[PDB]
Design an enzyme around this catalytic site. Structure first.
Site, short mmCIF file in Angstrom:
data_model
loop_
_atom_site.label_atom_id
_atom_site.label_comp_id
_atom_site.label_asym_id
_atom_site.label_seq_id
_atom_site.Cartn_x
_atom_site.Cartn_y
_atom_site.Cartn_z
N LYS A 126 -8.87 11.22 3.04
CA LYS A 126 -7.77 10.61 3.80
C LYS A 126 -8.23 9.94 5.11
O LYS A 126 -7.65 8.93 5.53
CB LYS A 126 -6.69 11.65 4.09
N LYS A 140 -0.75 8.03 -5.97
CA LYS A 140 0.55 7.41 -5.65
C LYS A 140 0.53 6.42 -4.47
O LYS A 140 1.52 5.74 -4.25
CB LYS A 140 1.65 8.46 -5.47
CG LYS A 140 1.58 9.33 -4.22
CD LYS A 140 2.57 10.49 -4.30
CE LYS A 140 2.12 11.68 -3.46
NZ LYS A 140 2.02 11.41 -2.00
N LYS A 193 -9.29 9.44 -9.12
CA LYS A 193 -7.99 10.04 -9.38
C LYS A 193 -6.87 9.03 -9.21
O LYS A 193 -6.94 8.17 -8.34
CB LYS A 193 -7.77 11.23 -8.44
CG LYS A 193 -6.49 12.00 -8.71
CD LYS A 193 -6.31 13.18 -7.77
CE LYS A 193 -5.94 12.74 -6.36
NZ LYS A 193 -4.57 12.19 -6.26
#
Ligand code: TYM
Ligand code: O8U
Lengths: 333, 325
Positions: free
Chosen positions: A112, A197, A194
């Protein structure tokens, strides 16, 4: 009383088929077997900067999506994280029983931080402690999550054990419930990454609320491999895209990979992709049909939030009382 | 009235420096300002502690503040953990605080996250009450600055939700230095307790510590104020002046032809005179559990009314779905 299940999902981005397979699918199936509590984690969502209107809308979208999936408010407790102050309260307290090194070593924080270099905030770093507070508040036995959350879950167990060892049987030590298939659904154009979203590249993602037709087109364009002849076989190392398709199909239909391999004997990727598209285009059409019924009914959504926060607070206050007593705070009377 | 916020540590072992310095200053300004006193038990647990002692220390601190003259009808005094909004706002502000800002606080991987993250909780403590003024020491200037930066940053995104707090600049004027090291200030944080006089020390303990206090080798001994050359004697004069309100030149005249023995004797008698009246009030309050419960309940109730209004605006600005009551 039944063992307790707790899990949550962020109202940020648009939930993907990844989020459904890794988590929400299991949430629906556990509702009678265990005492189930499901949370829209809006306090976690704000670790990534969102527009205020989008956050509010996404919270309600996510609530309606839980309902559309089959989460029944008559069986499960459904609530918004920010509506129960005890999450924040226990989150602070648990900071004091969590090491800095445990948080800096987190994969998710590192991933992140690279993605949002202009907003490497303290909330993003402290993320796992609040998550531990979310779980530990409800005397949680089982936590249904995707593989990407295993590390966060491991920390919650460590914090629970560490706190219990000083103070007694205050928390339950929770266990992960990660599914055998669909625990980590990968990106359609980059099957080594991965499915997120929050990918800008929409083509990587199958949206739960994306138009099925657009989604069927996405499966047909999913990257496979150069094998000659094409063969439908599971091998994440050399056949990442085909393997991801097999994994998706297995998770949707409940058929095993070895069974699906037999089923696609002598067939090629057109058959595989036809069968994947069919199974997924089907779920989404049904799901999106229940969704609007729920999402446009504000009084019902307001009622579910009210009732769920009531139920949740009863459990959470009970645990926080014991935590505050044990650490040595003067009790509020 | 401007709003003033102070955090009181439930573990602080308060000295006559704390009392005659900042505390006495603030007791006499409870009608000039809207003063808030927050016993910071959520901050305390960043250091691992015996649970029962922390509970006791919270109540000891409350009773001592009451004894020093904090009036729960004039000011707001409450226990931090009794107001959930502190933790709530703390979490929200984490999301508008840079990791770098916390790493750069004047601090390897075995410190707890609370010790790393508490400056954000401090910011929340202050910003919750629309605080105008914060009286800080040098050691917490950096923390105040962070809370100003967080407030300005949040306001620039969402509108004027928070007041930007200011330091309270004027100092009390009472000077109180360490007894065995007259160059350094008497500090509640001093490991060497012979340097300090705690507010709950008895007359025998004070005598012993004042008797031991450092003084010069002047011949003849002379009771004259001179910080550079007579630090110890000057400290004794400053302490006595702070207690009795007599000026330094008055005391210099009072001790003309007197040795350091007579000064020390008068300082001990003066300080203990002050501490005996304070101790009577302390034990009276401290042993009255029902009174302490009522002060904590009323104070938390006052704090919560105000804190909830700010947090509601914070929550609305961020975009959270409002709670259903
Ligand atoms: N490509 C994928 N394939 C399979 N599963 C996936 C995929 N992407 C995501 N998931 C899983 O979906 C759940 C929700 O995702 P979130 O990003 O909201 O998931 C998260 O960010 C959590 N930290 C939210 C949370 C906060 N507090 C909690 C307490 C218990 C459980 C969960 C939580 C998750 O279970 C996640 O593992
Ligand atoms: C001061 O920051 C915090 C951090 C975490 C929580 N839960 C509350 C407050």
């Amino acid at each position: 009383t039944k063992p307790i299940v707790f899990s949550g999902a962020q109202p940020s981005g648009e939930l993907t088929i990844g989020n459904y397979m890794g988590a929400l699918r299991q949430w629906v199936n556990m509702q009678d077997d265990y005492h189930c509590i499901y949370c829209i984690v809006d306090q976690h969502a704000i670790t990534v900067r969102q527009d205020a209107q989008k956050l509010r809308k996404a919270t309600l979208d996510t609530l309606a999506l839980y309902l559309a999936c089959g989460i029944d408010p008559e069986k499960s407790t459904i609530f918004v994280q920010s509506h129960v102050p005890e999450h924040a309260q226990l989150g602070w307290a648990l900071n004091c029983y969590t090491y800095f090194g445990e948080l800096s070593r987190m994969t998710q924080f590192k991933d992140k931080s690279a993605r949002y270099a202009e907003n490497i905030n303290a909330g993003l770093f402290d993320y796992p402690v609040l998550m531990a507070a979310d779980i530990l508040l409800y005397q949680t036995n089982l936590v249904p999550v995707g593989e990407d959350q295993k590390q966060h879950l491991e920390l919650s167990r460590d914090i629970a054990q560490r706190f219990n060892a000083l103070y007694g049987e205050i928390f339950k030590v929770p266990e992960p419930f990660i599914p055998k298939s669909g625990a980590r659904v990968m990106s359609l154009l980059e099957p080594t990454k991965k499915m997120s979203k929050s990918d800008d590249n929409r083509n990587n993602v199958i949206g739960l609320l994306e138009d099925p037709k657009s989604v069927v087109k996405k499966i047909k364009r999913a990257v496979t491999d150069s094998d000659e002849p094409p063969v439908v076989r599971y091998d994440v190392q050399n056949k990442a895209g085909v393997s991801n398709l097999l994994d998706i199909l297995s998770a949707v239909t409940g058929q095993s990979i070895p069974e699906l391999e037999k089923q696609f004997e002598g067939k090629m990727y057109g058959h595989l992709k036809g069968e994947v598209a069919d199974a997924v285009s089907g779920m989404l059409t049904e799901l999106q049909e229940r969704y609007h019924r729920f999402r446009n009914d504000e009084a019902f959504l307001q009622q579910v939030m009210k009732d769920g926060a009531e139920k949740a607070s009863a459990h959470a206050s009970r645990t926080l009382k014991a935590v505050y007593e044990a650490i040595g705070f003067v009790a509020k009377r």
